[PDB]
Write a protein that binds this ligand. Structure first.
Ligand code: AGS
Ligand code: AGS
Ligand code: AGS
Ligand code: MG
Ligand code: MG
Ligand code: MG
Ligand code: ZN
Ligand code: ZN
Ligand code: ZN
Ligand code: ZN
Lengths: 566, 670, 298, 376
């Protein structure tokens, strides 16, 4: 008979008591309602597969022993939680279990969020919450969950075989027709699968240490959490730190562990006519996420109705009173980039670039561009880069790029080879991470000719075409461009035209809607006020910045206003 | 009789007794007698028991790591053999030392009858980290008889692999009866069970390994660029892969100069992945025991840069120090020297004693070493007090020696040359690893210089395209890369210290200052200080320079200047503990001076016009000057000194406002 | 053009604690029994082995009750599993005789010593031929009777040198078990052993073929083997039945010791061979370990 | 008994010094070991012989531990099992082959002991045919040298050398389809190394050098005599030869306690009209100096002067192979046609003549390498 884990049974009993006994006081009335019984009731009506469990709700039970036991040994205790949830659903809502369905337990809101570099080997198989910027995503693929196998000699099939990561075949063979166990055949027609996606995440820009490059991690989403991660945004993944076989550690220094078969209780004879099966144990750390939440790519859905149902009463009242103001345009203009003194025209252009125009498609088939492109040219130290830093730190889905550090494959899209294999993958470039956003490019003049050609192809066509290697594709690049460029010779020559001062090509010049030329003129009162503003900023930190609108309400107004089609 | 471990000359009983007597009977006066320092011996420091105090403070702090100096083992007479046994046989002797340390931890609390519980001492694993094991001979000068021996390597970290879980305990579960058991590793080999352990179930090949239930340990591989003290004829520097384990993982970042002591290993490498056939030529690496990140000859790393790294070090209990410990007496001496009336001239004079005069240049270098304070916004912005200096001038004005001194004195700077450096080599690149055959990201010179000073010699010889990279580093102290492999923004808070020559390789007074410097206004506006160093021929100046430069050759080994160790610790303390702020009186002087030079620039390019970046350079230089004198506020005197330094670096007093020319004989003073 | 890398060993540490069931400890206990046994006041077995070596008789005669006298554990191991313990005792005898023979020809003024033969006799209870059952299989039994016929001496191979047909790889096979009947427990290898050894650095797809080795007879060593037929005595046989008999195999110095018709008690292993009357039925036979003649004809 | 063999108890390495040509001339002996051969003249009939090859060393591998016999320990029996290795690759032992385990039913498991096994310091060197040994219109060939034991680090690139060793065959490395029979590769297991130009750092004040130095001193006027004998073919240019002799000698390098250094090497330029034999003087200085590299202003490019990253297959690692300035480290580097150089080479020399280092920050490596050339 099978032996049972007493700790696992206690964890299962505590979890099934927690699911049916936990309740909170209602905010509006004060009623004592059980949130997870209501969660199962909600899942029953809409035929959902996943249940979301808050971590502090689990932690406040007992003295915190159940939450610690689940968090430290999540891989071990996960099937016990699954069968406890199955028992609770069977007792309350038996109609869920018929469709046997796969239940996904999603934990969220952990007390501490760890970096990628704080991931250690002592937390393998434990509940964790990490964060990172998604750089690549994979196609949704089926993963063999409950395989079906036919024995070769039996020619009789067996069902419901659990698959634990690497591909396994049962050796039980309950049919007594044969006497062999190893030989089996897999039938994918009646086998059972799960959703599987592998998204690659990277360290956040502020989390990178002093001299090191960011290190990536392949985090895997299964079930309902698939396709909640998008390339180019910061996401918080809650899940379990798992371990994956790795072959690349063959040439690394150090004693690599190996697994030799133990031969002590095996009787042998020297009859004649000595080989053994030994395998290397080399591994790497991966993450298996159960809950994905996308935090803001900033520091802090086209229809208007679906956006307005998202906001509550106080926030929508703030939106209405902000719209109701007759001087709303001046407030919007003076609220853009409060650290920059003056340059009201550039702030107007940046605000209109954030708002943008509508996209119209002509009956014959051509598309009219609704994105507004801004180019800022002028003298050195005229706060041209401050605007671009403000835009990338404020506007969502915005990326900041240097002209010299960029590349043709880096700006649009790259075809990259992984692990010296036959498979090639597409990594999104700067114009794709800024899709329906603003791509900020300082030193556009320092960009060479080839990258300028590669970027005006995406400016004119609004698409990126890939024909490298065996990959052919057409990707979307609907992106407004905010460029900052210096004139030839550094200083802006007033005697020449705009085309004479700029070395960038004519297809670049023809697609910029607004050119803002900023000139440095030495006058007493302007220089005095600017110096007072700068030294006051340095003295007063954030107290010298007093915009009419905060960043969050400005973003809310921008999102509300982008729904309208004039 | 006497029992000896096979293959060694190490006896466990003799080594334990000798190390115990060393622990309970060592005084630092023995170390000073060994080092031939008799008049440096004092009363209250050396006469106390050193290691007994260290174990007492380890018990009080709850730590479990002892840093052992092997030269101290040489100092004690009974352990003079043990030192050799530590060098020859680290594996046995270090374990013997760990057992002796645990025994002494038990003894210190059972003998003195403390209230500390014995169970916490028993459950804790105490380990020792020996360092300073000998001279830093290069790894290419090592021999196959040096395998499994403690060695020192001073080097620069280039990159490091992510954390690798290596298996320690393996977890096996039966398929039919769910019987689970764990087996420990034995010298890298795990004996997987052929049959089930239970008497009820004995099915062969029924035990399967669960990769997630079993426990692992941390292992990291770090690529170190060795910089040995002695380099043979025609030898090119190489890189060593060195392995750190457990707590030492992620203790070393890319671009720092560290002193790694560890045992010298060699393992065979499989020729193919599918086969078990091993290569006869072994692969050598270093199994790291202890890492030293602090040097008295140079400054410490910036504490504002590694705050989250410091908190992670506190969490991981690695107990490696990134900054030097400051006692009470040397802090008192710091407070005493900060009260000197000639503190600015004393600190500037003590920078480069071998370099004669260049007082204003040394003052600027000193202010750049101090730097302005770093203000990060609560909203999300960041202002970095990094001072950038250009040294344009005549040949042989000892500017390249100034770059050498700054490169040696900084924690993690990188020295580079014009026309020998590229944009990709300055930002980041993708390389092929020799161990994994994988594409890895490696840092450029600007990223490796973050938190330090990037020294660029012969700045005029650099290409315009290569110099175009520097703009974002000078302005925002970041590098925003969008390439095929890297699309991110990397912090590069490196102060740029550049050296340059005029167009004709010598300053020509007929041509103006801007044409002589020959830099674009966007690049020249980002330099906080621009030092025009000139060669004016004089009688007394040439006589004094010749006497100073000839007095070095009087003997084989060459006013009052501070020692380099005290200067480094004073600058480090001032950078760490002083964050000056600007007052209204300083604000008035800043605005007045900025507006005054903006008005002066109206006269008729040929002349350096004033810039908003010059106002920011004024603020940074004033804040650095206030930080030097240990003041938490920036007063009017600091701003006046910053303006005076800015004017004197460009020789504005000698320059004519209209024509932009510089006259040598009239206004310049040598 | 390099040679074979060589593998050699040397004892350094104590290792794990020895076990009684270990083959080395059984051989050591057998050597101790041979060297240290005293019947009344003389070491009979070492003197017998010496006198056997001078007369060039490579065998030892050991009474089984002496094992009761010395060590019962090795006696029970030898009685339960004789096929696993008799080679160990022969190894002990030849290990003693190797150091006896070296000290002899260098003192009483090349030579190869074969594996010595264990001949062991006993005076214990005599199992009748009709009382042999299945629990005596692969065990030492003592049984008496009268001999019908002794076959001619067949030539078995002890040491044989072989060479590959085309590969020309030389190999040597030493055989120390000749007690099998109707079946080749030891035969020539099915494939060439040059490939698996990888003895040469060159290693010059090449296949030598199935069964490529041929026996080089002028460098091979052979011994003699005899088949005996033992019947129960005709005086004690039920009236209406033919008397039953058993086939026996003897080798080396046990051949040509008895003539047909003599009455002998024989110690031997009751064992099994398959002859090609029941789905799984095996013909029993006796591996003769010693022959004792009750009466000696004139 | 089973004892440790003598191979496992030897603390010494044995080498065969070739007999000199003079001693063979004294006693009417004709020795093939004494006569230096080029790499073209070493044919297949010289295999197995102790022969001397004359040539320039082009590439020297890093010293690595090449195992000859591996020691395994067994916990079951306590024996140490030693497995010899004489190939480029080996397979390890898994089950114990000692007599106690071989006789027993339960076999022990072997674990490697690196300290108890026997290693050799191993280097692979490439020796190239000299310019005067190559026939008309041919490319110089190369030969492999295996340096083992205490002879390691005695060969450095760019050294004119006589290497005496045993010409031995090796297993075939190459395409299987192109081999005909039992083809073997060749290498020269080095036994003795003779330097044509003795290094200045290896100088020792022995008894033999003392009498010759004293004779040269007491001959009188050592400075003028050494100056006139640099290039006796070139008439005149007494001051030029004097400063070239000072270039060869050089000044005293200075190290100051603050860490900065002042170079002791002199740099000399010879600018003049054609036909004044300055190229001949440069070639003469290259011949005199033990580490002399002669370069052309356009013949040597930027990558040929500073460094380049390359893969070493014997050690299987990427290493930085230096240029001409690296090859002439602690020696005189002679650059003919200095006015025809491009700006990158001018920049490299511009840094080298003062700093005595090259700082390379490219996509390959971010490093600083020592180049202490005295530049002519
Ligand atoms: N109008 C302004 N308002 C506020 N700060 C300003 C203004 N003009 C300049 N500054 C400051 O002066 C510096 C100018 O930096 P940048 O924005 O990089 O100049 P720039 O206009 O981008 O010219 P380049 O192309 O970088 S040379 C920053 O520290 C700004 O904060
Ligand atoms: N004022 C000085 N004080 C001390 N040493 C000096 C001084 N002026 C020149 N030297 C020395 O003269 C030599 C000239 O080398 P450097 O001054 O380092 O060259 P440089 O100043 O970088 O000018 P370059 O290289 O032609 S751009 C060095 O050994 C200096 O130490
Ligand atoms: N003073 C001299 N004594 C002896 N031979 C001389 C003298 N001057 C010139 N020659 C010879 O004239 C020839 C000139 O050859 P080079 O050494 O190439 O002269 P050069 O100065 O190098 O000319 P270049 O390469 O255009 S600078 C050689 O054969 C020299 O041997
Ligand atoms: Mg800018
Ligand atoms: Mg210089
Ligand atoms: Mg010439
Ligand atoms: Zn079956
Ligand atoms: Zn079981
Ligand atoms: Zn064959
Ligand atoms: Zn063994």
């Amino acid at each position: 008979k099978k032996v049972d884990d007493v700790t696992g049974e206690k964890v299962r009993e505590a979890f099934e008591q927690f699911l049916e006994d936990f309740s909170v006081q209602s905010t509006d009335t004060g009623e004592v309602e059980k949130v997870y019984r209501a969660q199962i009731e909600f899942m029953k009506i809409y035929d959902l597969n996943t249940i979301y469990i808050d971590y502090q709700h689990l932690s406040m039970r007992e003295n915190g022993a159940l939450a610690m036991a689940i968090s430290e040994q999540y891989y071990r205790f996960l099937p016990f939680l699954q069968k406890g949830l199955r028992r609770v659903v069977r007792k309350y809502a038996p109609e869920l279990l018929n469709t046997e369905r796969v239940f996904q337990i999603s934990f969220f809101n952990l007390p501490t969020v760890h970096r990628i570099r704080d991931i250690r080997s002592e937390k393998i198989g434990s509940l964790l919450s990490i964060s990172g910027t998604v750089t690549r995503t994979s196609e949704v693929r089926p993963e063999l969950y409950k395989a079906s196998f036919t024995c070769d000699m039996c020619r009789a099939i067996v069902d419901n075989v659990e698959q634990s990561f690497k591909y396994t075949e049962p050796t039980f063979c309950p049919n007594p027709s044969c006497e062999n166990r190893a030989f089996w055949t897999l039938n994918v027609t009646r086998s059972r699968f799960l959703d599987w996606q592998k998204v690659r995440i990277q360290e956040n820009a502020n989390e990178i240490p002093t001299g090191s490059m960011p290190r990536t991690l392949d985090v895997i989403l299964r079930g309902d959490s698939v396709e909640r991660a998008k390339p180019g945004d910061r996401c918080k993944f809650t899940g379990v730190e798992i371990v994956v076989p790795d072959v690349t550690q063959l040439g690394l220094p150090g004693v690599k562990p190996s697994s030799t078969l133990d031969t002590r209780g095996i009787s042998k004879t020297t009859e004649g006519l000595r080989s053994l099966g030994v395998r290397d144990l080399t591994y790497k750390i991966s993450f298996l996420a159960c809950h994905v939440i996308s935090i803001g790519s900033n520091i802090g859905e086209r229809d208007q109705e679906v956006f307005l149902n998202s906001l509550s009463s106080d926030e929508i009242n703030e939106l209405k009173e902000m719209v109701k103001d007759e001087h709303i345009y001046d407030k919007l203009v003076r609220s853009i980039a409060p650290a920059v003194f003056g340059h009201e025209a550039v702030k107007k252009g940046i605000l209109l670039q954030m708002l943008g125009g509508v996209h119209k498609s002509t009956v014959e088939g051509i598309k009219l561009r609704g994105d507004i492109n801004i180019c800022v040219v002028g003298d050195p130290s005229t706060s041209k880069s401050q605007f671009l830093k403000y835009v990338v730190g404020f506007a969502p889905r915005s990326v900041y790029t240097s002209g010299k550090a960029s590349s043709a494959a880096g700006l649009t899209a790259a075809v990259v080879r992984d692990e010296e294999g036959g498979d090639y993958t597409i990594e999104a470039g700067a114009l794709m991470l800024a899709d329906n956003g603003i791509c900020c490019i300082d030193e556009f003049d320092k960009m060479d000719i080839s990258d300028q050609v590669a970027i005006h192809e995406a400016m004119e066509q609004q698409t990126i075409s890939i024909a490298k290697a065996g990959i052919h594709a057409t990707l979307n690049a609907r992106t407004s461009i905010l460029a900052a460029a210096n004139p030839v010779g550094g200083r802006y020559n007033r005697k020449l035209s705009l085309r004479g001062n700029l070395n960038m090509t004519a297809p670049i010049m023809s697609r910029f809607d607004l050119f803002f030329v900023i000139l440095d003129d030495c006058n007493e009162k302007i220089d005095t006020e600017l110096a007072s503003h700068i030294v006051d900023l340095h003295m007063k930190r954030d107290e010298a910045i007093e915009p009419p609108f905060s960043a969050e309400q400005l973003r809310r107004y921008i999102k509300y206003a982008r729904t309208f089609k004039p | 009789p006497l029992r000896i471990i096979w293959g060694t000359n190490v006896s466990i009983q003799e080594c334990t007794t000798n190390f115990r007597n060393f622990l309970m009977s060592f005084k630092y006066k023995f170390r000073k007698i060994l080092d031939e320092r008799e008049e440096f011996i004092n009363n209250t420091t050396d006469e106390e028991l050193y290691y007994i105090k260290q174990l007492n403070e380890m018990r009080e702090l709850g730590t479990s790591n002892l840093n052992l100096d092997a030269r101290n083992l040489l100092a004690y007479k009974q352990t003079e053999d043990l030192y050799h046994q530590l060098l020859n046989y680290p594996q046995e002797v270090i374990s013997i030392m760990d057992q002796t340390i645990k025994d002494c931890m038990v003894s210190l609390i059972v003998d003195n009858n403390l209230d500390y519980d014995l169970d916490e001492i028993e459950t804790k694993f105490y380990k020792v980290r020996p360092y300073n094991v000998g001279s830093c001979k290069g790894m290419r000068e090592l021999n196959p008889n040096d395998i499994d021996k403690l060695i020192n390597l001073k080097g620069l970290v280039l990159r490091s692999t992510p954390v690798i879980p290596d298996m320690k305990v393996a977890f096996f579960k039966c398929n039919v009866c769910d019987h689970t058991m764990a087996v420990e590793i034995d010298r890298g080999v795990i004996q997987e069970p052929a049959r089930c352990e239970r008497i009820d179930c004995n099915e062969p090949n029924s035990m399967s390994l669960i990769h997630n239930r079993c426990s692992f340990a941390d292992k990291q591989v770090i690529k170190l660029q060795e910089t040995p003290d002695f380099v043979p004829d025609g030898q090119t520097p190489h890189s060593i892969s060195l392995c750190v384990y457990d707590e030492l993982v992620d203790s070393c970042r890319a671009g720092d100069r560290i002193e790694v002591t560890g045992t010298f290993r060699s393992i065979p490498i499989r020729a193919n992945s599918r086969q078990r056939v091993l290569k006869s030529l072994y692969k050598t690496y270093v199994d790291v025991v202890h890492v030293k990140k602090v040097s008295d000859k140079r400054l410490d790393v910036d504490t504002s840069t590694i705050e989250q790294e410091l908190m992670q070090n506190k969490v991981d209990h690695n107990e490696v120090e990134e900054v030097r410990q400051i006692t009470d007496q040397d802090l008192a001496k710091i407070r005493e020297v900060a009260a000197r009336e000639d503190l600015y001239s004393l600190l500037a004079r003590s920078i480069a004693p071998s370099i004669y005069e260049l007082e204003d240049v040394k003052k600027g270098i000193l202010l750049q070493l101090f730097g302005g304070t770093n203000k990060t916004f609560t909203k999300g912005g960041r202002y970095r007090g990094d001072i950038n200096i250009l040294l344009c001038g005549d040949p042989s004005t000892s500017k390249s020696q100034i770059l050498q001194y700054v490169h040696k004195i900084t924690p993690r700077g990188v020295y580079t040359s014009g026309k020998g450096s590229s944009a990709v080599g300055l930002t980041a690149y993708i390389t092929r690893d020799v161990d994994t055959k994988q594409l890895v990201l490696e840092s450029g010179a600007l990223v490796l210089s973050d938190g330090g000073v990037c020294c660029i010699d012969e700045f005029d010889k650099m290409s315009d395209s290569t110099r175009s990279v520097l703009h974002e580093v000078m302005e925002q102290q970041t590098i925003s890369i969008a390439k095929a492999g890297i699309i991110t923004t990397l912090n590069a808070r490196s102060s740029i210290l550049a050296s340059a020559n005029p167009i004709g390789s010598r300053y020509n007074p007929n041509l103006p200052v801007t044409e002589n410097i020959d830099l674009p206004p966007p690049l020249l506006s980002r330099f906080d200080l621009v030092y025009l160093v000139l060669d004016k021929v004089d009688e007394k100046n040439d006589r004094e320079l010749a006497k100073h430069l000839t007095n070095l050759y009087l003997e084989d080994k060459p006013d009052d200047v501070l020692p380099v160790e005290f200067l480094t610790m004073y600058i480090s303390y001032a950078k760490e503990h002083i964050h000056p702020i600007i007052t209204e009186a300083a604000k008035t002087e800043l605005v007045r001076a900025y507006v005054g030079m903006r008005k002066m620039g109206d006269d008729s390019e040929k002349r350096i016009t004033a810039t908003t970046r010059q106002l920011e350079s004024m603020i940074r230089l004033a804040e650095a000057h206030a930080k030097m004198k240990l003041k938490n506020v920036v007063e009017l005197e600091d701003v006046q000194e910053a303006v005076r330094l800015i004017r004197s670096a460009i020789k504005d007093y000698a320059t004519d406002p209209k024509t932009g020319k510089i006259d040598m004989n009239l206004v310049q003073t040598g | 053009s390099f040679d074979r890398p060589e593998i050699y060993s040397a004892p350094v540490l104590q290792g794990e604690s020895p076990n009684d069931d270990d083959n080395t400890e059984i051989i050591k206990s057998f050597k101790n029994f041979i060297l240290e046994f005293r019947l009344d006041s003389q070491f009979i077995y070492r003197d017998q082995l010496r006198n056997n070596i001078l007369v060039k008789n490579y065998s030892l005669t050991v009474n089984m009750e002496h094992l009761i006298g010395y060590n019962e554990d090795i006696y029970k191991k030898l009685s339960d599993e004789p096929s696993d313990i008799i080679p160990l005792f022969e190894t002990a005898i030849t290990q003693v005789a190797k150091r006896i023979s070296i000290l002899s020809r260098a003192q009483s003024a090349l030579n190869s010593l074969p594996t010595f033969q264990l001949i062991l006799n006993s005076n214990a209870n005599q199992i009748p031929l009709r009382d042999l059952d299945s629990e005596h299989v692969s065990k030492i039994v003592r049984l008496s009777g009268i001999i019908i016929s002794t076959s001619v001496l067949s030539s078995r191979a002890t040491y044989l040198s072989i060479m590959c047909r085309n590969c020309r790889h030389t190999t040597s096979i030493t055989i120390n078990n000749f007690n099998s009947i109707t079946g080749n427990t030891v035969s020539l290898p099915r494939s060439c052993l040059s490939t698996i050894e990888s003895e040469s650095s060159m290693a010059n797809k090449k296949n030598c073929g199935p069964d490529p080795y041929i026996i080089i007879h002028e460098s091979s060593k052979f011994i003699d083997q005899q088949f005996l037929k033992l019947q129960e005595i005709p005086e004690l046989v039920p009236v209406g039945e033919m008397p039953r008999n058993l086939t026996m195999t003897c080798d080396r110095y046990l051949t040509n010791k008895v003539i047909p018709g003599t009455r002998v008690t024989i110690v031997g292993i009751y064992s099994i061979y398959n002859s090609k009357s029941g789905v799984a039925i095996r013909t029993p036979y006796i591996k003769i370990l010693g022959i004792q003649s009750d009466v000696e004809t004139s | 008994t089973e004892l440790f063999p003598p191979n496992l108890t030897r603390r010494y390495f044995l080498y065969f010094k070739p007999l000199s040509q003079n001693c063979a001339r004294r006693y009417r002996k004709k020795a093939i070991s004494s006569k230096p051969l080029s790499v073209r003249q070493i044919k297949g009939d010289f295999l197995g012989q102790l022969i001397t090859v004359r040539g320039i060393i082009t590439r020297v591998s890093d010293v690595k531990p090449a195992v000859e016999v591996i020691a395994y320990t067994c916990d079951q029996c306590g024996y140490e099992v030693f497995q010899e290795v004489n190939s480029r690759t080996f397979t390890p032992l898994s089950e114990c082959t000692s007599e106690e385990c071989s006789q027993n039913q339960t076999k022990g498991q072997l674990f490697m002991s690196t300290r108890a096994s026997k290693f050799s310091a191993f280097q692979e060197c490439k020796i190239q045919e000299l310019s005067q040994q190559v026939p008309v219109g041919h490319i110089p060939r190369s030969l492999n040298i295996h340096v083992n034991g205490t002879l390691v680090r005695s060969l450095s690139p760019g050294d004119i050398v006589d290497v005496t060793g045993i010409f031995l065959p090796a297993p075939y490395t190459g395409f299987k389809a192109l081999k005909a029979g039992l083809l073997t590769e060749t290498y020269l297991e080095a036994q003795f190394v003779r330097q044509h130009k003795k290094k200045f750092a290896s100088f020792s004040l022995t008894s033999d050098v003392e009498e010759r130095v004293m004779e040269l001193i007491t001959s009188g006027d050592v400075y003028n005599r050494l100056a006139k004998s640099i290039a006796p073919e070139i008439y005149g240019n007494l001051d030029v030869k004097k400063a070239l002799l000072l270039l060869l000698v050089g000044g005293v390098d200075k190290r100051v306690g603050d860490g900065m250094k002042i170079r002791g090497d002199i740099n000399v330029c010879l600018m003049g009209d054609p036909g004044v034999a300055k190229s001949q003087l440069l070639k003469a200085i290259c011949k005199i100096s033990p580490r002399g590299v002669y370069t052309t202003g356009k013949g040597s490019s930027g990558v040929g002067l500073t460094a380049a990253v390359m893969k070493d297959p014997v050690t299987d690692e990427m290493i930085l192979e230096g240029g001409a300035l690296v090859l002439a480290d602690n020696g005189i580097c002679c650059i003919d046609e200095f006015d025809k150089m491009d700006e990158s080479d001018r920049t490299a020399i511009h840094e080298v003549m003062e700093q005595q280092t090259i700082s390379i920050s490219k996509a390959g490596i971010n490093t600083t390498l020592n180049a202490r050339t005295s530049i002519l």
